[PDB]
Each structure stands twice: as structure tokens, then as C-alpha cells.
Amino acid sequence: GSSGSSGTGEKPYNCKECGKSFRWASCLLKHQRVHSGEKPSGPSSG
Ligand SMILES: [Zn+2]
After folding, report:
1. What ranges of residues constitute the C2H2-type zinc fingers?
2. How far apart are CA 33 and CA 16, in angstroms?
């Protein structure tokens, strides 16, 4: 029960596809690869 404290830190880069965060750009640009090609996760295994 603080209701107020110091420690407001958030990364500048933040993905919109899923809603993740990243310190550097490249770090995010690389993750964007997942939002480029869909992966077989579901109907794959009967
Ligand atoms: Zn994402």
C-alpha cells in the first residue's frame, strides 16, 4: 500500500503487434520477424 513512489522507467521501443518492449531498435526489428510469417501452431497436430 504505497499509493505513490519513484521508479517510472519504460523502454522507448514498444511493439504494437503483440505489445512487447525493447531497449534498442534492432532488438525490436528482429522480433518483428514473428509478425511476418505465421507459424503452424494449432491444426498442425490433429
Ligand atoms: Zn510483437
Report:
1. 13-35
2. 13
Q: Distance from the CA of 19 to the center of ligand 1, in angstroms? A: 6
**Per CATH, which fold does 11-46 belong to?**
Double Stranded RNA Binding Domain (3.30.160)
| CA 1 / ligand 1 centre spacing (Å) | 33
What secondary structure, in 3-state letters, does 1-46 show? CCCCCCCCCCCCEECCCCCCEECCHHHHHHHHHHHCCCCCCCCCCC
Å from CA of 22 to ligand 1 middle: 10
